[PDB]
Amino acid sequence: PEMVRGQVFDVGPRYTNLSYIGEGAYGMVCSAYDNLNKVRVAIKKISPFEHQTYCQRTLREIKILLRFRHENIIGINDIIRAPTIEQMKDVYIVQDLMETDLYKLLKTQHLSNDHICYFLYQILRGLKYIHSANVLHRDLKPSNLLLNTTCDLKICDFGLARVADPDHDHTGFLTEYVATRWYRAPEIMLNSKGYTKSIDIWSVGCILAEMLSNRPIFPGKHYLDQLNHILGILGSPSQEDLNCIINLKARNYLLSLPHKNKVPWNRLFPNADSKALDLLDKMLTFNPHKRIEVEQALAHPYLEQYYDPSDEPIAEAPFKFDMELDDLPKEKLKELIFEETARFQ
Numbered sequence: 001p002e003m004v005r006g007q008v009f010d011v012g013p014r015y016t017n018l019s020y021i022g023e024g025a026y027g028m029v030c031s032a033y034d035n036l037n038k039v040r041v042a043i044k045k046i047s048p049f050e051h052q053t054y055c056q057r058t059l060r061e062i063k064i065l066l067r068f069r070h071e072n073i074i075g076i077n078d079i080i081r082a083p084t085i086e087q088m089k090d091v092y093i094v095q096d097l098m099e100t101d102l103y104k105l106l107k108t109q110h111l112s113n114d115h116i117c118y119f120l121y122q123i124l125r126g127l128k129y130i131h132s133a134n135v136l137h138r139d140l141k142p143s144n145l146l147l148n149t150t151c152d153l154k155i156c157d158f159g160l161a162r163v164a165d166p167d168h169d170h171t172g173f174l175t176e177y178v179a180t181r182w183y184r185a186p187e188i189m190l191n192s193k194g195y196t197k198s199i200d201i202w203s204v205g206c207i208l209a210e211m212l213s214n215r216p217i218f219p220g221k222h223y224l225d226q227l228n229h230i231l232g233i234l235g236s237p238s239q240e241d242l243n244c245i246i247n248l249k250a251r252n253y254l255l256s257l258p259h260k261n262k263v264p265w266n267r268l269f270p271n272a273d274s275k276a277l278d279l280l281d282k283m284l285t286f287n288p289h290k291r292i293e294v295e296q297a298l299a300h301p302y303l304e305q306y307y308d309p310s311d312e313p314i315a316e317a318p319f320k321f322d323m324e325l326d327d328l329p330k331e332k333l334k335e336l337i338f339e340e341t342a343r344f345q
C-alpha cells in the first residue's frame with residue numbers, strides 16, 4: 001500500500017512504484033509498474049461515494065470507456081475495487097501509460113506546422129468517434145490530450161462526459177458550469193447547458209489556437225471575464241447571431257455592450273498557415289448552429305494529407321439516451337458502479 005500526495009493507493013502488489021501524474025476534484029492519477037505484464041501503466045484513483053454528483057460522473061466515465069475502442073482514445077485495461085460494496089471505498093482505473101500531455105508540451109516546446117496538423121487530425125479523429133456514439137466529451141483541453149514519443153495522441157478524462165441532449169440545451173444567463181473556463185464556449189455563459197456537440201468543437205478551436213502560439217487565446221481571469229475575452233477577439237455578435245438568443249437577460253447584456261470589430265486571425269497568428277487560420281475561424285464561430293462540425297473539420301483543406309474517411313471509424317453501439325443518474329442517491333449509484341466493475345474481479 002504505497003502513498004502519493006497523501007493518498008493511499010491500494011493497487012499492490014500487482015502494481016508497484018507509484019509516481020504522481022495529476023489530480024482532480026475527487027480523483028488522482030499515478031504511473032506504476034504492472035508486475036506480470038512487464039510494463040508501466042497509468043492508474044486513476046476515484047473517490048466519489050461521498051457525493052451524488054461524483055457518483056454520477058464516475059458511472060458515466062466507466063460506462064463510456066468500457067464501450068469505446070479507438071486508437072485516439074484512452075481505454076481501460078483493468079479496474080480495481082474491493083470485493084464487496086461494504087468494503088468498497090475507492091475505484092481504480094488502469095489505463096495505458098502515455099509519456100506526457102499537450103499542456104506539458106506547450107509550456108516548453110514550439111510546435112511545427114506538421115506537428116500541429118497531425119495533432120489536430122488525431123483529436124478530430126477521436127472526436128468523430130465520440131460524437132458518433134452520441135457522446136459529448138465536455139472537457140477537451142491540453143492537459144486532457146496525451147502524447148508519446150512518436151506523436152500518437154489519445155483523448156482522456158471522460159468524467160464530465162454525457163449523452164447529447166439537444167432538445168434540453170436552453171438555459172438562463174450566467175448559469176453555473178463545471179467545465180474548464182478557457183475552453184468554454186460563449187453560449188455556456190448566455191443560454192446553453194452544453195448538451196450539444198458544438199460545445200466540443202469550440203474547445204478544439206481553442207486548442208488549435210494554443211498550439212499556434214503556445215498561449216491560451218481566451219485567458220479569462222474568472223467566470224465573468226471569459227466572455228470579455230471571446231467578444232474582444234470575435235467582436236460584437238451580428239443581428240442574426242443575436243436573434244438566436246431569446247433569453248432577455250443574455251440578449252440585453254449583449255446589446256448593452258459598445259460596438260467592437262472582429263480581430264483578424266492573421267494579426268494574432270502572423271506565422272500561421274492560412275488554411276489553419278481558415279479552419280480555426282470555423283471552429284471558433286460565435287453562433288453554435290453556424291459552427292463547423294467534426295466531420296466537416298476533417299474534410300478541411302488544412303488536413304487534406306491525412307483525411308481518409310474509410311480510416312476514420314465510428315462507434316458500433318452508440319448510446320440511446322442519457323441515464324437518469326441525477327435523481328439517484330449516492331447509495332444506488334454506488335451499487336451501479338459496483339455492478340459495472342464486476343467483470344474485472
Ligand SMILES: COCCN1CCc2[nH]c(-c3ccnc(Nc4ccnn4C)n3)cc2C1=O
Pocket residue numbers: 021022023024025026027028029031042044074095096097098099100101104143144146156157158159
Ligand atoms: C483524476 O483526474 C481525472 C482527469 N484526468 C487528469 C489528467 C489525466 N492524465 C491521464 C494519463 C493517462 C495515461 N498517461 C498519462 N500520462 C501523463 C500525462 C502527463 N504526464 N504523464 C506521464 N496521463 C489520465 C487523466 C485523467 O483522467
